[PDB]
Design an enzyme around this catalytic site. Structure first.
Site: not given
Ligand SMILES: NC(=O)c1ccc[n+]([C@@H]2O[C@H](COP(=O)([O-])OP(=O)(O)OC[C@H]3O[C@@H](n4cnc5c(N)ncnc54)[C@H](O)[C@@H]3O)[C@@H](O)[C@H]2O)c1
Ligand SMILES: NC(=O)c1ccc[n+]([C@@H]2O[C@H](COP(=O)([O-])OP(=O)(O)OC[C@H]3O[C@@H](n4cnc5c(N)ncnc54)[C@H](O)[C@@H]3O)[C@@H](O)[C@H]2O)c1
Lengths: 330, 7, 330, 7
Positions: A240, A269, A289
């Site tokens: 993360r 993000e 991601h």
């Protein structure tokens, strides 16, 4: 037929066949919680969500009929699971649909750092001409022998264990720090365990993050703790964004304290090379991601999530649920 | 097609 | 002090300390054989060379004093070892200085194909914005689950065996074709052996080249044999350019018959994205002949090569030589 | 430095 809503998405083509006969399936395509149709807030009994929105206690208070939230994925830091529980909402995840995908993506990042295949690709795409052996050694400068290096894993659950199994045959010594595990996994899988973050960082040539983001590990890798990493270490983060302070990492990369870094996840993000703390940082690989993604894994998790909604709607909450993560607060 | 509830 | 010449190079900084006390060490930096100082042709008793020039029988006839050639590397297709033998010249290689480097680089190529880390990197460097989960699945489209795939290895010597050892923990089924091996390696290392090229290509999801280039395997992968590969197979070549017909591969990639290809080696080096048969081919990763390279491996092989010259100059030829590859013709 | 014999 009770309404079930996909909060931060459009596509419902896998979930609809599984649910159509029990629920009205709807989408909100919300990028924030203010973009949720008030019909959903009033009527929806089940919700499906990805990692691209966050639900706080104040957000959860707005739902009047909701009884279950299924995270289509493993991480659930983006939901206040305690608030949800206290409010009568069960929260579930799909913990194991992408364990091998993530672990293969991670081993790929590590190999990209040691062997530089991505950078060498980029070199060729920028028109570098590597005729001679002096030129080869020049452009590949930094590539390093793996046998005998220490790989340090922070978090030794599903993804961390998958990474260890793969890393041994390259000749890595694997060491892990995971303060929440009982005694024994280290003996089972024949790796070494250390008992503090500092010992891990000191002993590691390459450090890889495999812990969930929680109340106690925000900016775990920071200005202070990066100074405890070996000089010229590699950092990999496929866990993360919030675990790593990007300002500290930018600086460490620029001074050459960290030799290179590979991030699949970021503090904000979506990641762009043209904005944020890592704007002009050398020796950086990023992916957007995707560590979890493959044709098969995405189908597996969307079926699993839809199945979980089916159980909550036809069964008992939370006894019927396969992977409820907030039973303690429910 | 699912139900469009977007804003 | 007998002259020893590095034919296609400049840098002699590792070899000189080992040799200075026995030989005059010189360099020609030749990119072809017409660029060799006639002093070398007349006087040199030992030569060192990389892969960037080729010595034919006619080239070897020009040397008047030469007694040994050491290839700084494993492949020696670029020397007519039979001609050399008949002419009184021993040829040696460094067979095992980069076995793990090559095998790690290869596993990295394979992982780059299945997980698409390189392309995703390139996507981000071209300013793609991957906000949403639909966008993630879009940009990563094609990434595939590895567990249960067949990896087919053509050549099962040092690099091929290293690749197998690494590939098992990802859940690949490993199968190899190697018509020159005796019965038994397959039982030792617990992989499956097939007995024709066709069986290998038919059964393989991913095919990887690990054979030496020889008189009998030029364009082994060609227009006919590519049609025998599975639809949507991946091809990896970290062995030699001459094994693969690039015209056939370009076509197969363009029609989508091969899903993707990763080449470290090419029919004409140096490789450019802007010229040759693969000019506009989709789903191509290339690196500029770097699979062997790392700090440690390059130091290991340059010491080994210099050591080999030392033995030939102070010892007997070829009994003193560690890794002479032309004893049969000498 | 080695002996420069290049052309
Ligand atoms: N990049 C991606 O696409 C992707 C894909 C899958 C999972 N993930 C992330 O990876 C995380 C780990 O996933 P998993 O399936 O292995 O979860 P898991 O729960 O099986 O493993 C997490 C482990 O981290 C340990 N941990 C927690 N806090 C820690 C700390 N401060 N220091 C060290 N160890 C700590 C826990 O004890 C647990 O053993 C997930 O929470 C998710 O956020 C990311
Ligand atoms: N890309 C790089 O930088 C790099 C680095 C190292 C080696 N290599 C290349 O890899 C080749 C293999 O190296 P290695 O050390 O494993 O050599 P090796 O001699 O140990 O293995 C080569 C194997 O290929 C087998 N083989 C020969 N012809 C074959 C055919 N037609 N079909 C199938 N198998 C066949 C041989 O029997 C042998 O088992 C080397 O010759 C060299 O050209 C490339």
């Amino acid at each position: 037929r009770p309404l079930v809503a996909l909060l931060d998405g459009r596509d419902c083509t896998v979930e609809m066949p599984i649910l159509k006969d029990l629920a009205t399936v709807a989408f909100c395509d919300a990028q924030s919680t203010q973009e949720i149709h008030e019909k959903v807030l009033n009527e929806a009994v089940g919700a499906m969500m990805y990692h691209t929105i966050t639900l706080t206690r104040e957000d959860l208070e707005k739902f009047k009929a909701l009884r279950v939230i299924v995270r289509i994925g493993s991480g659930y830091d983006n939901v206040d699971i305690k608030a949800a529980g206290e409010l009568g909402i069960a929260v579930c995840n799909i913990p194991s649909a992408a364990v091998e995908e993530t672990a293969d993506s991670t081993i790929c990042h590590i190999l990209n750092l040691y062997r530089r295949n991505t950078w060498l690709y980029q070199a060729l795409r920028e028109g570098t001409r590597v005729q001679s052996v002096e030129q080869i050694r020049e452009v590949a400068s930094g590539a390093a022998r793996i046998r005998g290096e220490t790989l340090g894993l922070i978090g030794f659950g599903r993804t961390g264990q998958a990474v260890a199994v793969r890393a041994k045959a390259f000749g890595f010594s694997v060491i892990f720090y995971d303060p929440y595990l009982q005694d024994g996994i280290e003996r089972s899988l024949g790796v070494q365990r250390v008992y503090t973050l500092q010992d891990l960082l000191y002993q590691s040539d390459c450090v890889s993050l495999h812990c969930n983001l929680n109340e106690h590990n925000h900016h775990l890798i920071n200005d202070f703790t990066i100074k405890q990493m070996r000089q010229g270490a590699f950092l990999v983060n496929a866990a993360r964004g919030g675990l790593v302070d990007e300002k500290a990492l930018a600086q460490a990369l620029k001074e050459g304290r960290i030799r290179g870094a590979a991030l699949d996840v970021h503090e904000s993000e979506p990641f762009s090379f043209a904005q944020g703390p890592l704007k002009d940082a050398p020796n950086l690989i990023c992916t957007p991601h995707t560590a979890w993604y493959s044709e098969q894994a995405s189908l597996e998790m969307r079926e699993a999530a839809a199945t979980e909604i089916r159980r909550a709607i036809t069964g008992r909450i939370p006894e019927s649920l396969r992977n409820c993560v907030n039973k303690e607060f429910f | 097609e699912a139900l469009d509830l977007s804003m």
